[PDB]
From Swiss-Prot, chain B:
One family name in Pfam for this protein: tRNA-synt_2
UniProt entry tagged with the keyword Transferase: no
Gene Ontology molecular function: any one: acid-ammonia (or amide) ligase activity
Catalytic activity: D-beta-lysine + L-lysyl-[protein] + ATP = N(6)-((3R)-3,6-diaminohexanoyl)-L-lysyl-[protein] + AMP + diphosphate + H(+)
Entry protein name: Elongation factor P--(R)-beta-lysine ligase
Mutation effect (residue 101 to A): No effect on activity
Family, similarity comment: Belongs to the class-II aminoacyl-tRNA synthetase family. EpmA subfamily.
Gene that encodes it: epmA
Recorded superkingdom: Bacteria
Its EC number(s): 6.3.2.-
Disrupted gene: phenotype observed: Mutants have a reduced pyruvate oxidase activity and a reduced growth rate, and are highly attenuated for virulence in mouse models of infection. Salmonella epmA and epmB mutants share extensive phenotypic pleiotropy, including an increased ability to respire under nutrient-limiting conditions, hypersusceptibility to a variety of diverse growth inhibitors, and altered expression of multiple proteins, including several encoded on the SPI-1 pathogenicity island.
Description of how the protein assembles with itself and partners: Homodimer.
Length: 317, 309
């Protein structure tokens, strides 16, 4: 019956125990928990993100946007001096329900002032070991991953070389006509690399190409890559971490470029001036990470979809 | 500058300690924590509530409503066997920001199978004493509060009698609306001064989620807690009968120049399947934290209120 929960009672008890462990993990490291809004008068500019919008009575209401990630408010807190902070929030992305996506989901996001990407990866690995009781993670660069799995260099290979690889994977249909080099790299990573990682233990992939920087600063030593990592385990994308952007002008260029592209494609998005204002005042150098709690719980239970770990997925909420 | 949080660093650190204290309270009592949706294909019919609505792409699109409280999903869990459970969630009500309101706010809602209203009140009192280091609560009925502060009986006074009383307070054709004005203006400023005040047995018309008292049909098994001028919690002996719940929703819609809301069948269906006898309570965590901090507004304990979020 559609009235019943999506997840079993035993799975929801284990869910609460994991949430408690996560909280003990950060308590033990002196990391403060914060709560930030689920709604903003501003939204994100990323072309790949689709925000929920709702009207607030505010005689003239205010448009509000549900938060795809608590990043901007947490950076505002950091700029104001909160120190190392974590949050376990409900996040909202207007995406269809899938085995591994729900339009509302639990995010674990945290920030560590004065931590570089490597020190943060190590902390994420310790958390995985604790919750999953899994082995210590392996780490490799995006480059190394391609070289080991596909015998190509993704930082230097031309599109012909790229389609040669795609052909070997039985992917020529999609690859032959695709003329965007980075898009071909994503096809190859998804189809040629992802199936061969995260098997025995979690796998960190870091130094994604500059085009796939997302929230990451570009690597100063090699502008071809970004200070971003992603963790994979048993075929599941669990987390993305970054050496965060502290430069206001650089951040603003990102948003403006985003809205310029959206126009070329999508509505232009109300920029978070509050975030740019925080960066102008001064955000401590930091690395931050966003982890999918529902996926973590799914893996900890050996469950096969989010419907097993979320009380009511959107189809019956 | 607008970029800065509403709440100070010290207040947020104290807020987190309180969150963890609430969790310790329930852990010590073996109550399970759950998480239920912030969004639903269904909504509420309650005449006092204004939800947010937002459009979902779907598996074409679907209208979603944000949750005003986790009640309906927690009842579904209860009907499925979850046992005593609490939740600390963000709840959503489409109403302007005020000193004591934000359109998104933290709710502590919990449910106790086999607790009556009195046993639940006692448990609320214990939590308040823990968080606030306040004195044990006093309790009185809606009737007693009107008798002690206004010298009238709200259960039997006629409208003339009521207007006379409103006249004496230096202040409408509905008797219940009259009672509401009297309570807000004549009773509320005069309770919760030195310790939390539990008001119980609200009139039948103000039943909200509560069963009617079987022993006196003029009143409901509902209580409200007030402290230092502020409304902190609402608790009920819960409705378990599907037929009665549905008639209440039908009536809700009748009373609604407000839009008519659909009745949530999943809730009714859970009630049909069987909801254990239980009492539940909804508490305003931000309000509670504000009182713990001796602060004046929610802007002092919420990292970013809506005006700057
Ligand atoms: N719709 C969704 N449902 C469940 N988990 C998600 C969803 N979107 C993102 N995630 C998780 O959140 C993490 C952070 O995503 P991002 O903020 O896009 O880097 C991802 O690695 C996923 O584990
Ligand atoms: N907009 C709001 N902002 C902050 N607290 C609220 C808001 N609406 C309701 N509350 C709190 O939530 C409690 C339970 O709500 P209710 O069940 O509607 O009485 C109330 O007693 C208030 O403490
Ligand atoms: Cl107890």
């Amino acid at each position: 019956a559609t009235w019943q929960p999506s997840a079993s009672i035993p799975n929801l008890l284990k869910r609460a125990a994991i949430m408690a462990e996560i909280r003990r993990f950060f308590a033990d490291r002196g990391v403060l928990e914060v709560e930030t809004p689920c709604m903003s008068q501003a939204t994100v500019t990323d072309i790949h993100l689709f925000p929920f919008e709702t009207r607030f009575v505010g005689s003239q209401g205010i448009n509000l946007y549900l938060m795809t990630s608590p990043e901007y408010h947490m950076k505002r807190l950091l700029a104001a001096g909160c120190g190392p902070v974590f949050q376990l929030c409900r996040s909202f992305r207007n995406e269809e329900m899938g085995r591994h996506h729900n339009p509302e989901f639990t995010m674990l996001e945290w920030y560590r002032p004065h931590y570089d990407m490597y020190r943060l990866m190590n902390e994420v690995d310790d958390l995985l070991q604790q919750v999953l009781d899994c082995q210590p993670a392996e780490s490799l660069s995006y480059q190394q991953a391609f070289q080991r799995h596909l015998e190509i260099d993704p930082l230097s290979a031309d599109k012909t070389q790229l389609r040669e690889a795609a052909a070997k994977l039985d992917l020529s249909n999609i690859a032959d006509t695709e003329e965007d080099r980075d898009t071909l790299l994503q096809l190859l990573f998804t189809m040629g690399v992802e199936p061969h990682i995260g098997k025995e233990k979690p796998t960190f992939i870091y130094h994604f190409p500059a085009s796939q920087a997302s929230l990451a600063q570009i690597s100063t030593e090699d502008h071809r890559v970004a200070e971003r990592f992603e963790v994979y385990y048993k075929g599941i994308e669990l987390a993305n971490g970054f050496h965060e952007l502290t430069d206001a002008r650089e951040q603003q260029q990102r948003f403006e470029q985003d809205n310029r592209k959206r126009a070329a494609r999508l509505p232009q998005q109300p920029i978070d001036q509050n975030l740019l204002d925080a960066l102008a005042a001064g955000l401590p150098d930091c690395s931050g990470v966003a982890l999918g709690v529902d996926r973590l719980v799914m893996l900890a239970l050996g469950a096969e979809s989010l419907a097993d770990v979320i009380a009511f997925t959107v189809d019956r909420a």
